[PDB]
């Protein structure tokens, strides 16, 4: 703040750190799971 | 200051050759990813006004409620103006400034004189530059200047019943939803001039309003002046999460 | 300066289209947004020109209220229409339509219409007197817009 | 004559800089406003006829 | 200022009071040590000098 008579050590003590993680929009997946599956038990 | 964490982008696996079925390459490559962070802050807006002790008697009626309501409405007006088109110098950055600095300010073809009006098609074309976030209409907000609204009222594409249902202009004289977007009119857009803006579309969920202190009123008595001073203060700002979600249509040059 | 010089020609080369009338709402500014607080008045010649509008003929154009089916123009662009014959004579730079914010105008009045009958025996006449005291005033210096012919 | 009071327009507060936080400018600027009046009047309309 | 107490995780008042009190104590001891006579008490060093 650096405006009153007394000041804090640095901006680390003027800050609140949050453990919240947020993500943007991700491309939707379409072809990954639209076909039927053919299981195998050999090469 | 408040700081939050932002989850990084996406990696990918690898296809291993059959020859490496026994070597160390059978497990493919290594994925890596580093977090990031974002910050928030606030600005202080304030105003003051004094009333001397000679005027309350020197009047047939009181003059205090007028003073209080004028202070409040001045605060609100300044907030709205700054949020609309404020700069970054000691004030919140306006939506138009964000669009300009994001290169999302689209130069349209409408002229500043009237040679080309503002059409519904031009407004709807802006959804392209929003990329992924433009695919959902329910998460969008459209705001148009007054002149833009009056230009839309004369749009040739919303005139007849055959064209647009029963919501044709000729039957109503007003424009509600446009291309699936609701219309909200604002008067705080800049002046009608070349290169200036007339509309903006905002991803509503991407914008927050940080606030430290709400509207407060501090009254002070000054006996040596025989005045009553009134002080109104608050600390607000307008911040977003990621550099996207805002596109603004502008006039031609 | 609410006198919009429209492109309609008094000589009659170009008629007075409906779009021309609706464009006048732009000049009203903040008061022109809400439709229910407006009144539209047009001259008789303007009304007959409205009846010859290409844009109000077909059913597919304007619902059931096409001119070809009725012959009277009612609401125009959401504005009900009223015809008055007290406009000036059709000439260059003359008004044919008026849009007015209704509540901006008031009618002050001191005394109503009164009739006084006097018997003048020195002249064998009965004098009849009719008097009233009124005016037309508006609150704020706005609220009315009128369009005029070209040239 | 009838006289009516007209309320004036709106003011605007100020964004105080961080440097002036401890000074008197932290209170911002002052907003003023003067009332106004509007007057109404009338006219007389008269006509006469004899028999 | 009022825009510092909110602008910090922890209060800063006890520090202020302590600093003021200790400023008084340091100043008074220094003055009694070698305070001159001009607006301040004469210090023992000054007294011994003048005698």
TrEMBL record, chain C:
<protein>
    <submittedName>
        <fullName>Major head protein</fullName>
    </submittedName>
</protein>
TrEMBL record, chain E:
<protein>
    <submittedName>
        <fullName>Major head protein</fullName>
    </submittedName>
</protein>
């Amino acid at each position: 703040n650096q405006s009153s008579s007394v000041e804090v050590s640095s901006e680390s003590y003027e800050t609140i750190f949050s453990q919240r993680i947020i993500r943007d929009l991700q491309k939707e997946l379409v072809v990954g799971a639209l076909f039927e599956e053919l299981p195998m038990s050999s090469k | 200051i408040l700081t939050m964490l932002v989850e990084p982008d996406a990696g990918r696996a690898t296809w291993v050759a059959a020859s490496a079925y026994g070597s160390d390459n059978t497990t493919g490559s290594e994925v890596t990813g580093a977090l990031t962070e974002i910050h928030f802050s606030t600005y202080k807006l304030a105003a003051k006004s004094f009333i001397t002790d000679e005027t309350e008697e020197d009047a047939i009626f009181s003059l205090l409620p007028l003073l209080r309501k004028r202070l409040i409405e001045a605060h609100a007006v300044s907030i709205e103006e700054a949020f609309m088109t404020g700069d970054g110098s000691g004030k919140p950055k306006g939506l138009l400034t964000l669009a300009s600095e994001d290169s999302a300010k689209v130069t349209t073809e409408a002229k500043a004189d009237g040679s080309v009006l503002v059409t519904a098609k031009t407004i709807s074309k802006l959804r392209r530059k929003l990329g992924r976030h433009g695919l959902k209409l329910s998460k969008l907000v459209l705001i148009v200047s007054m002149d833009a609204y009056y230009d839309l009222l004369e749009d040739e594409e919303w005139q007849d019943v055959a064209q647009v249902g029963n919501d044709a202009v000729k039957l109503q004289g007003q424009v509600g939803r446009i291309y699936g977007l609701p219309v909200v009119v604002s008067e705080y857009f800049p002046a009608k001039a070349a290169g200036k803006e007339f509309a903006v579309i905002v991803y509503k969920d991407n914008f927050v309003m940080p606030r430290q202190r709400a509207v407060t009123v501090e009254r002070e008595r000054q006996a040596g002046k025989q005045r009553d001073a009134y002080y109104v203060t608050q600390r607000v700002n307008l911040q977003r999460y990621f550099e996207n979600g805002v596109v603004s249509g502008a006039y031609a040059a």
